[PDB]
Design an enzyme around this catalytic site. Sequence first.
Site, PDB file in Angstrom:
ATOM      1  N   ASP A   1      -9.865  30.726   6.568  1.00  0.00           N
ATOM      2  CA  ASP A   1      -8.597  31.123   5.562  1.00  0.00           C
ATOM      3  C   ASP A   1      -7.107  30.165   5.811  1.00  0.00           C
ATOM      4  O   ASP A   1      -6.978  28.977   6.306  1.00  0.00           O
ATOM      5  CB  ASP A   1      -8.411  32.746   6.222  1.00  0.00           C
ATOM      6  CG  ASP A   1      -7.074  32.417   7.859  1.00  0.00           C
ATOM      7  OD1 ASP A   1      -7.260  31.589   8.163  1.00  0.00           O
ATOM      8  OD2 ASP A   1      -7.282  33.641   8.109  1.00  0.00           O
TER       9      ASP A   1
ATOM     10  N   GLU B   1      -5.911  37.062  -2.240  1.00  0.00           N
ATOM     11  CA  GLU B   1      -7.521  37.158  -1.164  1.00  0.00           C
ATOM     12  C   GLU B   1      -9.050  35.347  -1.588  1.00  0.00           C
ATOM     13  O   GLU B   1      -9.260  35.556  -1.202  1.00  0.00           O
ATOM     14  CB  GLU B   1      -7.824  38.167  -0.697  1.00  0.00           C
ATOM     15  CG  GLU B   1      -6.898  38.806   0.262  1.00  0.00           C
ATOM     16  CD  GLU B   1      -6.140  37.907   1.587  1.00  0.00           C
ATOM     17  OE1 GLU B   1      -7.175  36.816   1.743  1.00  0.00           O
ATOM     18  OE2 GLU B   1      -5.742  38.369   1.893  1.00  0.00           O
TER      19      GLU B   1
ATOM     20  N   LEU C   1     -11.223  38.507   7.504  1.00  0.00           N
ATOM     21  CA  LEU C   1     -11.357  37.583   9.174  1.00  0.00           C
ATOM     22  C   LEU C   1     -12.723  38.681   9.820  1.00  0.00           C
ATOM     23  O   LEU C   1     -12.436  38.963  10.817  1.00  0.00           O
ATOM     24  CB  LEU C   1      -9.817  38.037   9.844  1.00  0.00           C
ATOM     25  CG  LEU C   1      -9.854  37.281  10.897  1.00  0.00           C
ATOM     26  CD1 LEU C   1      -9.466  36.004  10.722  1.00  0.00           C
ATOM     27  CD2 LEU C   1      -8.494  38.074  11.858  1.00  0.00           C
TER      28      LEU C   1
ATOM     29  N   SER D   1      14.266  44.174   7.166  1.00  0.00           N
ATOM     30  CA  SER D   1      13.378  44.080   6.048  1.00  0.00           C
ATOM     31  C   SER D   1      13.038  46.006   5.679  1.00  0.00           C
ATOM     32  O   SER D   1      13.075  46.398   4.080  1.00  0.00           O
ATOM     33  CB  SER D   1      12.265  43.439   5.898  1.00  0.00           C
ATOM     34  OG  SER D   1      12.589  41.572   5.841  1.00  0.00           O
TER      35      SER D   1
ATOM     36  N   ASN E   1      15.526  39.168   2.708  1.00  0.00           N
ATOM     37  CA  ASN E   1      15.582  38.919   4.014  1.00  0.00           C
ATOM     38  C   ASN E   1      13.961  39.184   4.544  1.00  0.00           C
ATOM     39  O   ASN E   1      13.767  38.335   5.092  1.00  0.00           O
ATOM     40  CB  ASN E   1      15.762  40.615   4.743  1.00  0.00           C
ATOM     41  CG  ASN E   1      15.496  40.727   5.991  1.00  0.00           C
ATOM     42  OD1 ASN E   1      14.527  41.370   6.525  1.00  0.00           O
ATOM     43  ND2 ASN E   1      16.574  40.347   7.264  1.00  0.00           N
TER      44      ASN E   1
ATOM     45  N   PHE F   1      -2.313  43.760   5.141  1.00  0.00           N
ATOM     46  CA  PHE F   1      -3.836  43.156   5.536  1.00  0.00           C
ATOM     47  C   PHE F   1      -3.945  41.920   5.144  1.00  0.00           C
ATOM     48  O   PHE F   1      -4.569  41.576   6.114  1.00  0.00           O
ATOM     49  CB  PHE F   1      -4.524  43.982   3.927  1.00  0.00           C
ATOM     50  CG  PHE F   1      -5.612  43.132   3.486  1.00  0.00           C
ATOM     51  CD1 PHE F   1      -6.610  44.415   3.630  1.00  0.00           C
ATOM     52  CD2 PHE F   1      -5.847  41.832   3.723  1.00  0.00           C
ATOM     53  CE1 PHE F   1      -8.209  43.726   2.637  1.00  0.00           C
ATOM     54  CE2 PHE F   1      -7.719  41.166   3.225  1.00  0.00           C
ATOM     55  CZ  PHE F   1      -8.171  42.252   2.843  1.00  0.00           C
TER      56      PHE F   1
HETATM   57  O1  LIG Z   1       7.488  45.608   5.169  1.00  0.00           O
HETATM   58  N1  LIG Z   1       7.134  46.399   4.466  1.00  0.00           N
HETATM   59  C1  LIG Z   1       6.171  47.364   4.727  1.00  0.00           C
HETATM   60  C2  LIG Z   1       6.134  48.505   4.519  1.00  0.00           C
HETATM   61  C3  LIG Z   1       5.670  49.516   5.294  1.00  0.00           C
HETATM   62  C4  LIG Z   1       4.857  49.443   4.996  1.00  0.00           C
HETATM   63  C5  LIG Z   1       4.148  48.437   5.953  1.00  0.00           C
HETATM   64  C6  LIG Z   1       5.255  47.729   5.635  1.00  0.00           C
END
Ligand SMILES: O=Nc1ccccc1
Length: 162
Positions: free
Chosen positions: A20, A11, A32, A117, A132, A104
């Site tokens: 940003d 960041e 933000l 994912s 993915n 974040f």
């Molecule tokens: O996709 N990744 C994450 C896994 C757990 C919590 C937040 C994001």
Amino acid sequence: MNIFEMLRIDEGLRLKIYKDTEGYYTIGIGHLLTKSPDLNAAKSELDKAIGRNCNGVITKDEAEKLFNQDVDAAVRGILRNAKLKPVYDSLDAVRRCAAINQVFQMGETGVAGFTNSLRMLQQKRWDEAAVNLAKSRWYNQTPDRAKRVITTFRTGTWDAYK
Ligand SMILES: O=Nc1ccccc1
């Protein structure tokens, strides 16, 4: 390395209001302020967040205070999210940092489009999850950062951050 050092790299630290990567008024370590294009609205949010009339500028201590609040709120948000909590709790400490980083940046909302994912991460199918995760607006818009976060999810090491 820890979540604060990781997000500090991703960041940056700027003490004056800046825009940003999405063009939104921000300050400090990725705090933000608003999605409003009105700089005065951003200044009002800043003054409210800090508790004084800042005129668009803060100190390093103030930036670090917002950052502490923002990291805390990101983690607590994950724990309060029914979709994210079980995945988070299944992860090791390093991969948990990758999850916090993504929330974040994107907000818990975005991370919770990521259904596939998340499932692969819970299954510990690390290379598949990594493939993915890159099929995303996130990766295309901020590829260098996304690559670091994805490597962290893939490996459970801090290799991408040194
Ligand atoms: O996709 N990744 C994450 C896994 C757990 C919590 C937040 C994001």
